[PDB]
Amino acid sequence: MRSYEKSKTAFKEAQKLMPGGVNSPVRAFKSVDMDPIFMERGKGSKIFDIDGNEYIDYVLSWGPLILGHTNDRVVESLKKVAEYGTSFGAPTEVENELAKLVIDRVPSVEIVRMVSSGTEATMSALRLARGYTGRNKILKFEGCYHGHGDSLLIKAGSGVATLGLPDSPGVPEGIAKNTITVPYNDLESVKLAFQQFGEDIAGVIVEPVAGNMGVVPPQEGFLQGLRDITEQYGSLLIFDEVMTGFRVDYNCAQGYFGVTPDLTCLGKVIGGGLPVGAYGGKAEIMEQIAPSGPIYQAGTLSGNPLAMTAGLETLKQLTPDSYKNFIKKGDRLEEGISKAAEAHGIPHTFNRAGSMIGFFFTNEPVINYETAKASDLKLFASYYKGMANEGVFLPPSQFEGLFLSTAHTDEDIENTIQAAEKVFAEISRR
Amino acid sequence: MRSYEKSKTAFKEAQKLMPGGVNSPVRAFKSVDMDPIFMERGKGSKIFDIDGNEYIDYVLSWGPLILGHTNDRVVESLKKVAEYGTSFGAPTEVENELAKLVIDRVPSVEIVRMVSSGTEATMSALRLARGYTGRNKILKFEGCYHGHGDSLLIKAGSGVATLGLPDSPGVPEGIAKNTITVPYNDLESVKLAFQQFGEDIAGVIVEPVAGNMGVVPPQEGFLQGLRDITEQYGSLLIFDEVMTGFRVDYNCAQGYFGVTPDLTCLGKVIGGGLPVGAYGGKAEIMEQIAPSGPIYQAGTLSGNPLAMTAGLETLKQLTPDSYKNFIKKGDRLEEGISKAAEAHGIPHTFNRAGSMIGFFFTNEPVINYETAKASDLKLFASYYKGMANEGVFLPPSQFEGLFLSTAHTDEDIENTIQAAEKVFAEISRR
C-alpha cells in the first residue's frame, strides 16, 4: 500500500493560500482521481513526495529535468553560483555562455534574449513579430499552448478561418481580434486564414510538436507549409520550442524536422529546472528589441546566473546519443504499454515525435486537438491513480506526454510497463 | 586607477549574442558615460565585477538583495534545496511557507499566486481586475513601470484624461484603448478619468512609491484618494509593490502608508535574487484565478523551490529594525551627498519614502515623471562614471533610487559620500 497523508495535509494548507491551492492549474490534479502529490526531492528518474513515496518521474518538472532530478554536475555548479551571487541586475558572463550555446544548438537562433518564463518568451516573440512586420494579426493553432500572455489567451472565432475571440475573462478588449486560430495539422485552414488576412498576419506561432494537448507530431508537410505560407505573405514563423527545445532532438524540433523558423521561443531545459525562458531568431528581427531597437521588452531578473548556469550545465551533458536513448526508451515504453493495453482491451494510441512520447486513451489517431479530446478522460483519471500507486508519477493530465530523462533506466521502463499492465488489468476487471 | 577591460571584452561578446548585448535595456548602460560593468560575485554590500573591482552596491539586483549579496543563511539553504531538487512541476511545501509568510506580512494579500516575474504578476493582476469586475479599462500612472506585459505597455492619449495609446511597436491593436494614463500624484486627473470611464474602469495600478522614474513618494492624500475613487466606482486598487514590497517598510508601502489595495503585485525580495513574482489580495478576487476560477493564469515553473526558499530565507532575516537602519543609513547618505552637492553647486533633490531613497540632479522637487525628467541626465551620466571609479556601483539610470541592504555599513555610507564629494568636486572644476 501507499500513503499520501502528508500531501493531503499539505494540500489542505495550500488551498487556504493560493487559488486552487496551487501556483499552476494542472498542479491541482483536477482530472486524475487523486489529490495533488507534494514533492520534496528527486534523484535522477526518481521523484519523492513529502510522504517519502518513490516514483518514476515522467513529468520531470514538465520538461526542464531532461537529465533527471538533482544531476550531480548541475547541482554542484548551482551551489558554486549560489556562493558568488544569485543575481546582480548587471550583465554576467554565464548569460553570454548560455546565449552562445543556445545560438550554437538552436538553428534559427542567432540572437537570443533571456526571459523569466515561456509565457514571456512567446509574448515577447508575438510583440517582436508584430513590431518587426508592422502588422497586427497572429495565427496560432487550436490545442497549442504558448503561455498565459493576454495576446495568446485567445480562441477560434465563429467560422473556418477566423479572427479570434478572448479565451479567458480579463483579457483586454479586442486583443484577440488580431489573432487567428485554426486546427493543428490543418494546413488548408492556414491557407484560408492567409487568403483573408495574410498581408496583416505578423506571424504564425506553433508548437512544432504539440505537447500541451498531448504529444501531437506535425503531419507531413505541415511545418514546411507553415514556413512557405509565412514567407509568401511576409509573416514571421515563430516556433514555440519551450517544451520541444532540446527535448525532441539535439537540434530541437526545428532541427529534427528541418524547418527553420524566424523566431524561436525556448525555456525549460535551458533553465535546468529554474525559472527561465528565451526568445531568439534572425539577428535583424531580434535587433528590433530594446535597447538596440524600438520594440520594448525588459526583465530585471532575466538572465539569472543560477538559471543560466543550471541550463548551461544541463545542456552540456546532452549529446545526440541522449536522444537515441530517449527513442529506445520510448520504443520499449510504447511497446510494453501498448501490449498491456491490447491485452486488457484498453483503447490506446501512441504519438512519437523524436524523443517525445505520449499516448491517448483512444484507438483513433490523434492528429489535432479535436482528436485528442476524443480520449477517455475518465479512464485516464482512473489510470493515473493506479500508476501513482505503482510508483509512477505521470503528468496529471491526458493532454501531456511522457517526459523522459537521461536518468531513466531500462528497469524504470520495465517497472513502468508492469505498472501499466497491473493498472490496465484492474481497470479491465471492473 | 580602475580597469574595466574584462567587462569591455565581455560586453563585446554580449553584443553579438543578445539585443543591445543585454537581457534587459538598463543593463546596456546607455545613459551613464561608461559601458556595462559585468558582475561575477558579491558579498553583503559589496559587488565585484569580472575585473575584480570592488563596489558598494546600490543596485542590489534592482531590489531583491535587501540583505546584500550572498547572505550566508540564504546561500546555504539554497545549496540545501539544490540537493533535493530545483523544480518538481508539482506542489511543494516551501510554496506554502512563502505563501503564508507573504500573506502574514503583506496586509492586502490573503491569497497569493506565485509567478516567474513582476511582469507576470502585474499582467495577471490586470487580467484578474478585468475578469473579476467584468470591465475593460485600467488606469495607470505616467512614469510608473509594471513590466513589459502588453496590457501595460501603454502611454497617455492626446488629452487630460485619456484612453491611452500603445507605448511600443508590436503591442496588440487597440490594447491600450482600454487603459488610462494620468500623471503620478495627480489625483484630480484620476477623478477626471473616472468621471468619463469610471464604470468601465476595472482597476487602478500604481506604484505606491514610484521607483522606476526615480524614487517618487506619493503626495499627501494621493494613495488614499486612489483607494476612495476605486471603491466609489467599484474599481480594483492594484498596488505594484514588486519593488516597494518588503523594501519601503516591513509591511510594504501599503502598510507604511496605511492604504490597503485590493490586489498586490510582489517580486524581487520574495525571490531573494532568483526569478520570482506574485500577485495576491482579497480572497474572493483571487479565487477567480484558475483552477478555482474562470480567469486563466498558469506557470509551469511558478513557485520554484529555489526562489521560494531564497525569498523565504531573505524575508525571515528582515525585521522592523532592518528598516530603521535603512532610514538611518539613508539619512547620512542624503545629508552627506546633499552637502557635497551644495558645496560644489550641484543641483540636487532627495526623495525619501520609508526605507527607499533616491536623488535627482535638479533643485526642483520631483513629484512626478515630468519633474523627474527635469533632472540633469548628462550630469548623471558623468557622475555615474566617477562613482563607479570610486567603488560605488549605482543604478545606471537617473530614474532609479539607491537600493540599500542590511549589509551596508556606516563605512560604506561614508565612502559613498566621499565618493560623491570627489565626483562633485571634479564636475564642479570643469
Ligand SMILES: Cc1ncc(COP(=O)(O)O)c(CN)c1O
Ligand atoms: C514596480 C515594478 N513592477 C513591475 C516590474 C516588472 O519586473 P520584471 O522586469 O521582473 O518583469 C518591476 C521591475 N522590477 C517593478 O520595479
Ligand SMILES: Cc1ncc(COP(=O)(O)O)c(CN)c1O
Ligand atoms: C510549448 C510551450 N510554450 C509556452 C509555455 C509557457 O510556459 P510558462 O508556463 O513557463 O510560462 C509552455 C509551458 N511550459 C509550453 O510548454
